[PDB]
Amino acid sequence: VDTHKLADDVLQLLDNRIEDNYRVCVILVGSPGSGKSTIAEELCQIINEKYHTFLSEHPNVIEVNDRLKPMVNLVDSLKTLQPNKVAEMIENQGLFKDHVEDVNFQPVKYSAEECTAVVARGGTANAIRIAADSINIAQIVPMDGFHLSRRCLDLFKDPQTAHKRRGSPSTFDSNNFLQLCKILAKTSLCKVSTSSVFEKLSKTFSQTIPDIFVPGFNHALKDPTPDQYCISKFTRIVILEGLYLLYDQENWKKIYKTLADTGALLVYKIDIDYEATEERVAKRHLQSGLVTTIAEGREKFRSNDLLNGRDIDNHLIKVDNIVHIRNDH
Ligand SMILES: [Hg+2]
Ligand SMILES: [Hg+2]
Numbered sequence: 001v002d003t004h005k006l007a008d009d010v011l012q013l014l015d016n017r018i019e020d021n022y023r024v025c026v027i028l029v030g031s032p033g034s035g036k037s038t039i040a041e042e043l044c045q046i047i048n049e050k051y052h053t054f055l056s057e058h059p060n061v062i063e064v065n066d067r068l069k070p071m072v073n074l075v076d077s078l079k080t081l082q083p084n085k086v087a088e089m090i091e092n093q094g095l096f097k098d099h100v101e102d103v104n105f106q107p108v109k110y111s112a113e114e115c116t117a118v119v120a121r122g123g124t125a126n127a128i129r130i131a132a133d134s135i136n137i138a139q140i141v142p143m144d145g146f147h148l149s150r151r152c153l154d155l156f157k158d159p160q161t162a163h164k165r166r167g168s169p170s171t172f173d174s175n176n177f178l179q180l181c182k183i184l185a186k187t188s189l190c191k192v193s194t195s196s197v198f199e200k201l202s203k204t205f206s207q208t209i210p211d212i213f214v215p216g217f218n219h220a221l222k223d224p225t226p227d228q229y230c231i232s233k234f235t236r237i238v239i240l241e242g243l244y245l246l247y248d249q250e251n252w253k254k255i256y257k258t259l260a261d262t263g264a265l266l267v268y269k270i271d272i273d274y275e276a277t278e279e280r281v282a283k284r285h286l287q288s289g290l291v292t293t294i295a296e297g298r299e300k301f302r303s304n305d306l307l308n309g310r311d312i313d314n315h316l317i318k319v320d321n322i323v324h325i326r327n328d329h
């Protein structure tokens, strides 16, 4: 895949929607070992570098507007987790014991300067937080930070599974990820003599957009960690990468439409080279200690449809704007 070409297409859409959308979103889907993480990172870096180069010769072009307007209310539609219930959750290690597997549990908010926390069935571990060369216009949102915590998985009606199948669609707080998408769509659909996309974006930043903090995944602690990625008023391009962003079940299915309805979405799905990916994933399992030999790793890859990508393909939502890309080496 030509990442510079991707960057060009992203900038083209942002420019086309400059007066209609505050930010553009990019969905990048791929099975384990497809390279979605790295592609997202490179795409992001390329865009920010181009912007920094632009600022070099347009030093004071940045302007923040809407100085006399109120902050966009992102979670007014959510019910407030009353103080008593907040304490209970915290007392219960930041979890909602009776809703860990409830995909219909609606996200709730509460005051955590003022900071608003938004949590769903995964509890505080997957909380989204909203506040009130240095300037980057692109940010990535890995789906990994929404992985349910290990302690959360211990509450599953069947603890044995969940852990054994950690990484399946049901082991992520899809409720809160969808909520992040609704928040992003709301910030995108806010009221927003040159042809330069960077010039246009530089003059249209808005003071009404709050900082949004999203969880990340700590590969060392084997659990999600708070505020690893910040999406601020300066973020005009959000690159979301993950396994289930185009999955046709439960809350995942609502992701595409939620972001597609902004009219500012680019969608990419990685088509893998089976052999190379099989080897890549087998090696990860070996390095991670999950298996004792590469052969055992290859076997797990072949027999687990969550690993070989068969599940993602079988459940790919039927839409006409998914651009399939290759990431061969
Ligand atoms: Hg995996
Ligand atoms: Hg759980």
Ligand SMILES: [Hg+2]
Binding pocket: 072, 186, 187, 188, 189, 190, 191
């Ligand atoms: Hg808005």
Ligand SMILES: [Hg+2]
Binding pocket: 211, 230, 231, 232
């Ligand atoms: Hg920030």
